[PDB]
Amino acid sequence: MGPVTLIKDIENQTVLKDNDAVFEIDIKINYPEIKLSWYKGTEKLEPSDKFEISIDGDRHTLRVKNCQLKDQGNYRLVCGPHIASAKLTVIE
């Protein structure tokens, strides 16, 4: 059935300044050695004062907290053969 099974991909997001934003992917991982990773631009992301990263079943979540203007950019993920990118736009 392949290394992974995509159910629902991430999408571009628009967020009000100072609000939290969330990127959300549903993907089933069929091989135990395969892991998903998150990026902004080309830099790998980790849990921090700015980012929340979590896993619940097949649901992978990247939360960008307290979004300022400089938090805009391209947020990406890699998981086996699957890859994706989504833009964060900050308004108001």
UniProtKB/Swiss-Prot annotation:
Task: Give the UniProt tissue specificity note.
Answer: Isoforms 3, 7 and 8 are expressed in cardiac muscle. Isoform 4 is expressed in vertebrate skeletal muscle. Isoform 6 is expressed in skeletal muscle (at protein level).
Q: Where in the cell is it found?
A: Cytoplasm; Nucleus
What is the recorded post-translational modification? Autophosphorylated.
Give the superkingdom in one word: Eukaryota
The record's family statement is: Belongs to the protein kinase superfamily. CAMK Ser/Thr protein kinase family.
The text the record gives for the protein's domains is: ZIS1 and ZIS5 regions contain multiple SPXR consensus sites for ERK- and CDK-like protein kinases as well as multiple SP motifs. ZIS1 could adopt a closed conformation which would block the TCAP-binding site.
The record describes the protein's role as: Key component in the assembly and functioning of vertebrate striated muscles. By providing connections at the level of individual microfilaments, it contributes to the fine balance of forces between the two halves of the sarcomere. The size and extensibility of the cross-links are the main determinants of sarcomere extensibility properties of muscle. In non-muscle cells, seems to play a role in chromosome condensation and chromosome segregation during mitosis. Might link the lamina network to chromatin or nuclear actin, or both during interphase.
Assembly information from the UniProt record: Interacts with MYOM1, MYOM2, tropomyosin and myosin. Interacts with actin, primarily via the PEVK domains and with MYPN. Interacts with FHL2, NEB, CRYAB, LMNA/lamin-A and LMNB/lamin-B. Interacts with TCAP/telethonin and/or ANK1 isoform Mu17/ank1.5, via the first two N-terminal immunoglobulin domains. Interacts with TRIM63 and TRIM55, through several domains including immunoglobulin domains 141 and 142. Interacts with ANKRD1, ANKRD2 and ANKRD23, via the region between immunoglobulin domains 77 and 78 and interacts with CAPN3, via immunoglobulin domain 79.
Tell me what disease the record lists for it. Answer: Myopathy, myofibrillar, 9, with early respiratory failure: An autosomal dominant myopathy characterized by adulthood onset of weakness in proximal, distal, axial and respiratory muscles. Pelvic girdle weakness, foot drop and neck weakness are the main symptoms at onset, but ultimately the weakness usually involves the proximal compartment of both upper and lower limbs. Additional features include variable degrees of Achilles tendon contractures, spinal rigidity and muscle hypertrophy. Respiratory involvement often leads to requirement for non-invasive ventilation support. Cardiomyopathy, familial hypertrophic, 9: A hereditary heart disorder characterized by ventricular hypertrophy, which is usually asymmetric and often involves the interventricular septum. The symptoms include dyspnea, syncope, collapse, palpitations, and chest pain. They can be readily provoked by exercise. The disorder has inter- and intrafamilial variability ranging from benign to malignant forms with high risk of cardiac failure and sudden cardiac death.
Can you say what this protein is called?
Titin
Name the source organism.
Homo sapiens
Give from-to of the shown chain within the full protein. 9582 to 9671 of 34350
